Write a protein that binds this ligand. Structure first.
Ligand code: GSH
Ligand code: GSH
Lengths: 207, 207
C-alpha cells in the first residue's frame, strides 16, 4: 500500500498526488501539521519530505518517487529514447520551479513582476518548442501516450497561471495542453475540490 | 558515438566524465571556452550545458544524461528497488551540490567557514548513515556492484575535500569510500592528470 507524507500544501508533492489520483491508484494522502514535523524529521533519510512508503520501503526525494511510480505503473515511455526524453523535459520543469520558488520565498514584492516579464516568457518558449516535436504538440509530451512528466508540467503550468493569468496567452500549445490536462476525467473533480478548498501552492501563503 | 559538450570546468559534467572514463567508454570531451558560448546557446533544448550527443540524439540535463548512460551500460542496479535506491541517493548528492554552489557563487568570503562548520557535517552524516544500509557501507552504494551514483557521490565528496581537507575525518565509511573510488584502476591516471592540470571545480575559480 501507498502512503505519501508531506506538508499541507501543493509544493513538491502535488505532481505525485496528481499521478495517483488520475490513474485511480489508492493512497493515503498524509498531510502533516507544522507542529508534528520536528519530532518526525529524523525518521527520513535526508530529514525532508516528500516521502513515499511503498510497503515497508521508504522512498524520499520527489524525483525518485516520480520515476519509481513511472516504472511501476507504465508511465515511463515506450523505449529508451522516450524515457530519456521525458526525464529531460521533467528536469527542465524542475529548473523552472527552482526559479519560481526563489522569487516566492525570497523576493515576491520586489521580483514578482520581473519574473513574469523577463524570465517566464523565455523559459516557456523552451517548453513550447519541445512540446511541438511530438504530434505537433496536440497530445501529451510523448504524443499519443501519457507519461509521468505530463502531470509534472501541468502542475508547473497551473501554478504559473495562478501567478500570471496571461502567462500562456502567447504559447498556444502550452495553453491548449494545460486545458487538456485539467479536463482529464480522472482529475476534473480533484482540481475543482482543490480549487475550492484553497489549498496553498506554497508554504508562505504567496502564489 | 558520444560527444559531451560542457564548459572547461568540473561542475555539472564531471560525474558523466568519470562514468565514461572508468568504464572505458570512448567519448569526445568537448570543452568549449566561455567566449564561444553565445554562438551556440540556442542550439540546446534549454539553452544550457552539459549536452551529450549519442549518435544524432541531443541529451541535455545532467541527471537525464546520467540515468540514460546507466540504463544503456548496465550501471543502474539489478532490479527495481536498487534502481530506486541509487536514484534517491543521487538526488541527495545533488541537494548538497546546490548548497555548495550557492556558497561558492554568492557567499564564499562570508559563508565558507560556517558552511564547513554548521551545514556540511549534518549533510555528510546523512550520507554516512544511508551508505551503511547496504553491506555495512564497506563497498559501493548498492554493495559489491558499482553503479552511476558512485561516480556522482565520489565527485561530490572529492570537491568537498578540496574545500575542507578535514571534511571526511569523522565519517569512517565515506572516508574509506572516497579512497576506494580514487584507487579504481579505471580512474586514477584520469584523477592524476586532472590533478596535474589543476582543472577548476567551478566557473568562478573558487574551490
Ligand atoms: N530535493 C528534495 C527537496 C525536499 C525539500 O526541500 N523539502 C522541504 C520542503 S520544500 C522540507 O522537507 N523541509 C523541512 C525541513 O527540512 O526541516 C525533493 O525534491 O524531494
Ligand atoms: N539543471 C541543469 C542545469 C544546467 C546549468 O545550469 N548550466 C549552466 C552553467 S552550470 C549553463 O550551461 N549556462 C548558463 C546559461 O547560458 O544560461 C542540469 O543539471 O544540467
Amino acid at each position: 500500500s501507498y502512503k505519501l507524507t508531506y506538508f499541507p500544501i501543493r509544493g513538491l508533492a502535488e505532481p505525485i498526488r496528481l499521478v495517483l489520483v488520475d490513474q485511480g491508484i489508492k493512497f493515503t494522502d498524509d498531510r502533516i501539521n507544522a507542529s508534528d514535523w520536528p519530532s518526525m524529521k529524523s525518521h527520513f533519510h535526508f530529514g525532508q519530505l516528500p516521502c513515499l512508503y511503498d510497503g515497508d520501503h521508504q522512498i524520499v526525494q520527489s524525483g525518485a518517487i516520480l520515476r519509481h511510480l513511472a516504472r511501476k505503473h507504465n508511465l515511463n515511455g515506450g523505449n529508451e529514447l522516450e524515457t530519456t526524453h521525458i526525464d529531460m523535459f521533467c528536469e527542465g520543469v524542475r529548473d523552472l520551479h527552482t526559479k519560481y520558488t526563489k522569487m516566492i520565498y525570497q523576493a515576491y514584492d520586489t521580483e514578482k513582476d520581473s519574473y513574469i516579464k523577463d524570465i517566464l516568457p523565455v523559459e516557456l518558449a523552451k517548453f513550447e518548442k519541445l512540446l511541438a516535436t511530438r504530434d505537433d504538440g496536440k497530445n501529451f509530451i510523448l504524443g499519443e501516450k501519457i507519461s509521468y512528466v505530463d502531470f509534472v508540467l501541468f502542475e508547473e503550468l497551473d501554478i504559473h497561471q495562478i501567478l500570471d493569468p496571461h502567462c500562456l496567452d502567447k504559447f498556444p500549445l502550452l495553453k491548449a495542453y494545460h486545458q487538456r490536462m485539467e479536463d482529464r476525467p480522472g482529475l476534473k473533480e480533484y482540481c475543482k475540490q482543490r480549487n475550492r478548498a484553497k489549498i496553498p501552492v506554497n508554504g508562505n501563503g504567496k502564489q
